A paper describes a structure:
Mylu-B*67:01 contains the most common 5AA insertion sequence, MQQPW, and also exhibits the D61/R67 pairing.
To explore this hypothesis, the COVID-19 P1 peptide was mutated at the P1-F position, generating P1-T and P1-E mutants that were more compatible with the P1 residue preference of Mylu-B*67:01ΔMQQPW. However, both wild-type and mutant COVID-19 P1 peptides exhibited better binding to Mylu-B*67:01 than Mylu-B*67:01ΔMQQPW. At the same time, some evidence also implied that the impact of MQQPW insertion is not entirely dependent on the salt bridge network formed by 61D/67 R. MQQPW insertion could enhance the binding of peptide P1-F and peptide P1-T to Mylu-B*67:01, but 61D and 67 R do not form salt bridges in their complex structures.
Author numbering:
A (entry chain B): 1 to 97
B (entry chain A): 1 to 280
C (entry chain C): 1 to 9
The structure:
Amino acid sequence: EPRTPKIQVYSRHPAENGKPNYLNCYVYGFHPPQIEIDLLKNGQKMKTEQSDLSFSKDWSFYLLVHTDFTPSTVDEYSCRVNHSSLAAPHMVKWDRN
Amino acid sequence: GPHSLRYFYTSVSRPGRGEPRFLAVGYVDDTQFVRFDSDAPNPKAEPRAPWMQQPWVEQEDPEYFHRSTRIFKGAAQIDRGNLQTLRGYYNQSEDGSHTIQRMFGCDLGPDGRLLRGYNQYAYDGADYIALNEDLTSWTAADMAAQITKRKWEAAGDAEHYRSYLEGLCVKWLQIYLDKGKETLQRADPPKAHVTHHPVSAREVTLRCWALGFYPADISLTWQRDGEDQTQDMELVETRPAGDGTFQKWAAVGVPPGEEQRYTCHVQHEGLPEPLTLKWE
Amino acid sequence: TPQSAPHGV
């Protein structure tokens, strides 16, 4: 009876193209806990850190996957998620808003 | 005010891929302070807040980590048991991976003293068994959970959770709250700002951002000349910044020229009085 | 400080 993950992609601080920052991918409300979460620069897998697994009152799991990045007008960032609840991986493009 | 110490245990069977993996984290309010993972090579309970890496730990209990380590190995081992019995209970096959979660802990009233105890379980994401705040009686959510209820009532297991809660839980919550005063009791207010994003000739999105706050509790709302429009606004779930602070935005699509008719509303523990703000 | 359940379900 899987629960589909909700996904938000965003920077720790307001993004100035040029200033080093942290790129976050927050995924929540999912079940089971088996999940694939990658951050992509121009569709290529970046090296990331993933928070310790936890879960909310309703038993759904949540993870923060994050890395350092420097925003460029040249560069596209996205969060890539595969869960049992999804027909295939979803990608969410990072938008500064 | 109201504070909580919570532990979150997750075991996952991995049929074919070895024995079950146990994970545990501990939190005080919205702040994690420990972790354990039974896949780690020489698995120990690990501090995950700074204030858990200070000398006070040694003096309060020189064995603190060895103890949490020991408890977590037990917890892990018991759940390897549970995942076999629950398979049995639910008459499920050997190949499926299944999940057992425990969440237990305590809340304090503003007096300081125990408000509520918690000790609750889920199987494959759904309610299984939970200790009532009588701390004597269980709610089994189904026919398999009833077996468990009968078992633990006959055996008087609730008594042990009661003594843990009444002794240890509150005691350590107070310890952690006093020892982590500057991080846990020092509330960071949200820094709010409104941003203007033309999103057609009929609507420019007014987005109210709230950033760098602790704790996670916050109310973000948009009013239109005194009229809250929560039903007609877009509001994301609160999200972790990555530095112990949280983020949230609320947005409304308004017709251009009407920008100053809207007012963003921010309420937060760390703010003296509520913030009200609009476009520049 | 944690706590482990006396018995399995």
